Amino acid sequence: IVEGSDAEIGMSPWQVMLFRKSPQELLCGASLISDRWVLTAAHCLLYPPWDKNFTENDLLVRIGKHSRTRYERNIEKISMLEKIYIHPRYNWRENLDRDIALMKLKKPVAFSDYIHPVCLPDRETAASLLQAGYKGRVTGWGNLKETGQPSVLQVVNLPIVERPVCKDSTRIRITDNMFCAGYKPDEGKRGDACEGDSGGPFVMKSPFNNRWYQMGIVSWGEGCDRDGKYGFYTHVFRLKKWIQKVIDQFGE
């Protein structure tokens, strides 16, 4: 996160750390949507151009964390994955279209003050909140600068930007399975997700039922906190049917 602040304890209890077994290292963020399912970006697991192709045995999920690096002895819970599910039409070849994946834990995690799931948006929630100008919140333990790493979980509030502005800031072909967020050069406030934040949640708080909803996944960007550039996120509601689908068929 670039130009964010440290998160308060329990501010983002659905925050998940994707953790490599060996070398032990942070892979990406993720989010807890139930006691057994985790949501992340498909690219965190599979990205052939970079020779990335992680399997279940390759990883650990860490939940209830605050510190980036310490094992948070009676707070964080570590789980193993039962199975990974990537969107069948994920596009790694051209633009990361449909960048989404689900991970089902081996065993269901217990909720606590620091461990609690986020809600998945419904048609109606999506429709009122996913509006240009409306702010969402991103969290992660990624880089503080484009070019280091926080000690603790960072947060930044950023405005959703109009589709045209998104399109015209880049050469990549933008799809309806994506949205962009950030401040405009004149807007005079900064912040972005940065390396190490991928797969994490973009959430919004409903003013109607005052519950937190996950609207996006940190997906891609060009640099971090650059003028006239924006971070791109998977549009969670648009892929909701595939999500529903896999949970109905494989678990829950």
Partner: peptide, 10 residues
């Protein structure tokens, strides 16, 4: 500079 996780998780 990642602190060691309990072998029980590996």
């Amino acid at each position: 500079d990642f602190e060691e996780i309990p072998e029980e998780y590996l």
